């Protein structure tokens, strides 16, 4: 798990990383540690990414919002745990870290555990985009821009989602 929790690099949420696993954690280093169905195996999967502090609430069954709808979706019947910690010291830089991105536009909501890494221009209006960004023709990913002085809700949080199949 040190490979997962102490990975030096984390994924953008739109390109969330998934590791096949084939009470020590349950640690004062985490700020969120919520389990569903199977409170504290065939297969275990560790999905990890970075989102804003105030989006961690979206990494839970039955949630809505740009992260849950367009970036990472858990099923109603989720059995697994959601673990998060503040990573402002790692993922913010003076001037801003713009390397972390999220998907802002999509023609439909993700299905559970679906991953969308498309960079296709999003047609928001009546005119086809033909591959070019412009009015009502949007590049579908947007940078976070994590600055060290941001409030806590706007700071980067690293998230690990453990699924029990």
């Amino acid at each position, epitope marked *: 798990f040190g490979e997962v929790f102490n990975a030096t690099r984390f994924a953008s949420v739109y390109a969330w990383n998934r590791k096949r696993i084939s009470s020590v954690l349950y640690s004062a280093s985490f700020s969120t540690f919520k389990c569903y169905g199977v409170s504290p195996f065939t297969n275990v999967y560790a999905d990890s990414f970075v989102i804003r502090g105030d989006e961690v609430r979206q990494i839970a069954p039955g949630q809505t919002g740009k992260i849950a709808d367009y970036n990472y979706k858990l099923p109603d019947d989720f059995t697994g745990c959601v673990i998060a910690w503040n990573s402002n010291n790692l993922d913010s830089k003076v001037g*801003g870290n713009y390397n972390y991105l999220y998907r802002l536009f999509r023609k439909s909501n993700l299905k559970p555990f679906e991953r969308d890494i498309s960079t296709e221009i999003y047609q928001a209006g009546s005119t086809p985009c033909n591959g070019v960004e412009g*009015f*009502n023709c*949007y590049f579908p990913l*947007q940078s976070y821009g994590f600055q060290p002085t941001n409030g806590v809700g706007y700071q980067p949080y690293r998230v690990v989602v453990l699924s029990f199949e």
Partner: antibody
Framework: VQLVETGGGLIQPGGSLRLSCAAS????????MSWVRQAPGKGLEWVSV???????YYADSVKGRFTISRDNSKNTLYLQMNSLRAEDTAVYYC?????????????????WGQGTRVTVSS | ALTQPASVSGSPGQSITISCTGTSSDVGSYNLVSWYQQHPGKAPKLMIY???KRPSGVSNRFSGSKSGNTASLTISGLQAEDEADYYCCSYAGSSTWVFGGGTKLTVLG
């Protein structure tokens, strides 16, 4: 939520000048930003726009002479104006595109700076 | 450039309309007409977007419409504070915009 332009002044014909537009209360890195100018006593004229991925568009009256850009870290928009002519004399406004909560443009401009005057004259 | 009357005027309490005549590739092609109010020395203020819609806070005395290549702004119940310059604006295709030349609205005193 506001926009504050600086950099205007008197400049000789043929000269160059860079205008700045500092945003407060939103990020230019996540919004669709334009410059619009207004000659003294005259009407508004759209000049240029920049999209979040960097793609830019320009009025034909300024294409090849002006460049719109932004510095995300300073949360600032710029207009670099080269080879200025008398006809470029105007108040220059930076403006935010009006969007819905989903960040889709309505085609209108909701937040405007106070303007900065540029006078091209010898 | 969209074509607006240079001057329109009316008495307090009356209604007036400002027209904005463009072409088939701007007003004619989209439902993307906006209108702006501009008081002396101030920046333009958005009054109408998408031909007919009002931003929150804008009085319902202001309304917009379109027919063919001509958009119109109507102001009912004219009040002294409405005296200002008004500009129409249309999307023009290819991520460009066009403005009218502006109308001076006088509330006759």
């Amino acid at each position: 939520v506001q926009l504050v332009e600086t950099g205007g002044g008197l400049i000789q014909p043929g000269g160059s000048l860079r205008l700045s537009c500092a945003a407060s209360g939103f990020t230019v890195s996540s919004n669709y930003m334009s410059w619009v100018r207004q000659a003294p006593g005259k009407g508004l004229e759209w000049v240029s726009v920049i999209y979040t991925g960097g793609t830019t568009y320009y009025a034909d009256s300024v294409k090849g002479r002006f460049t719109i850009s932004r510095d995300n870290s300073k949360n600032t928009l710029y207009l670099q104006m080269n080879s200025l002519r008398a006809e470029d004399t105007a108040v220059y406004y930076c403006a935010r595109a009006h969007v819905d909560t989903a960040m889709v443009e309505s085609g209108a401009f909701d937040i405007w700076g106070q303007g900065t005057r540029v006078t091209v004259s010898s | 450039a969209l074509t607006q009357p240079a001057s329109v005027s009316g008495s307090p309490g009356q209604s007036i309309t400002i027209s904005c005549t463009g072409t088939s590739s701007d007003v004619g092609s989209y439902n993307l007409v906006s209108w702006y109010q501009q008081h002396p020395g101030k920046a333009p203020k958005l009054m109408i977007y998408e031909v007919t819609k009002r931003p929150s806070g804008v009085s319902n005395r202001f309304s917009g419409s379109k027919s063919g290549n001509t958009a119109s702004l109507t102001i009912s119940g004219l009040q002294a504070e409405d005296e200002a310059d008004y500009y129409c604006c249309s999307y023009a295709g290819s991520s460009t915009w066009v403005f009218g030349g502006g109308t001076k609205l006088t509330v006759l005193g």
